[PDB]
From Swiss-Prot, chains A, B, C, D:
Its job: The biological function of streptavidin is not known. Forms a strong non-covalent specific complex with biotin (one molecule of biotin per subunit of streptavidin).
Source organism per UniProt: Streptomyces avidinii
Subunit description: Homotetramer.
Name listed for the protein in its UniProt record: Streptavidin
Family statement: Belongs to the avidin/streptavidin family.
MF (Gene Ontology): biotin binding
Length: 123, 123, 123, 123
């Protein structure tokens, strides 16, 4: 249990800020602020993590979702990050993400962006 | 607001069952049972959806996460589905997913599976 | 060797047409015409396939790339399909794809679309 | 035309080596040696790139495929990299990839890995 290791404030390579609390049971709850795209201020996030990971030096699997609607803007889209927490002096959360926009059925083929974010405790 | 359209029981092409409640504010809460893989019985899910989608015939963006730990099994992994809800006589949730396993850093390159699920209200 | 099974004309769910020749050694060579997006007429494709697949009922792994430049249009982008050929009465090529556009570094995070195409010998 | 910029020997973060020749018309031809996985020695690659990219500081879209069969090993799989070439003092090819294995239809849901490689001219 990396409840303590995961809970807190994280930053990715784009300058985004992820603030999360990890629950004893597996819950992730917090806010996300993107440095890029059709986004301003904080958005609600929720997710899950493996509260009893392997002890053989493997990372801790986790994911979370942001729907890009808040009181300021609605980008009609949602991103999910799937990845793993790796603890130790330079802790990191290494993720891949899928960002789907609402589209018509004719445009569904171009609905989803894919990328990768690395979160650290500094920067 | 597709709160009413999304809330309920869904089935995908693999025979999996997703039971979800959509909150007025954007919350998704429920359980997921996979017909395949290292999984048995129900797992907690949480996510988010766009509670005020475009009215121009576009779908409703949403996502959710399952960490594959419950009282029966721990597969040290998490899947996130990112996609869109499309309403109407044959309602569907069309998704793409990322399934990350906890790994050592040497094996991180083979940590993440990707696929696509289509959920319907029947089958 | 599915050289014979793969060589020919394929159609996907979007109405696109893939014409391919499979070489004895693993080569794929042909043309692709997309029914959607910033594309008109035929584009060059090249790829590779497993010329000696498992005989245990598994599919045949393959991939290919199109750069979306031809004599009519340049969409400054390239798609790669990765997937498998499955033979038998209803032969199919089941793929997932990545479509990267050229972008500035500031916009690289939104450079890549992801989707899934299923190709059949009819429609 | 980054024919000259792309042609040559590249290295990724895993210690893999990509040797490529870019043709005037858009062709990519070469060999790939993976530092990881079920692979030994060199494998054939083929792909495509945008031979007339935008001049507004955007990268050059490209992709390529390796089928993991050579005279030493057959891993019944293929990877496609989709990405962009960025020129200048620290040139890079930034990619995302899809690695599909041949599987039975029952196991198709776990056929495809996804990741990201960054290639540079040194290391």
């Amino acid at each position: 249990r990396d409840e303590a290791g995961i809970t807190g404030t994280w930053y990715n390579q784009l300058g985004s800020t992820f603030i999360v609390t990890a629950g004893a049971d597996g819950a992730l709850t917090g806010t996300y602020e993107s440095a890029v795209g059709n986004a301003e201020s904080r958005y609600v996030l929720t997710g899950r993590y493996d509260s009893a990971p392997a002890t053989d030096g493997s990372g801790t699997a986790l994911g979370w979702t942001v729907a890009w609607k808040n009181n300021y803007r609605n980008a009609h889209s949602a991103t999910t990050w799937s990845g793993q927490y790796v603890g130790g002096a330079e802790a990191r959360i290494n993720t891949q993400w899928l960002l789907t926009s609402g589209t018509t059925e004719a445009n569904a083929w171009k609905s989803t962006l894919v990328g990768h974010d690395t979160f650290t405790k500094v920067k």
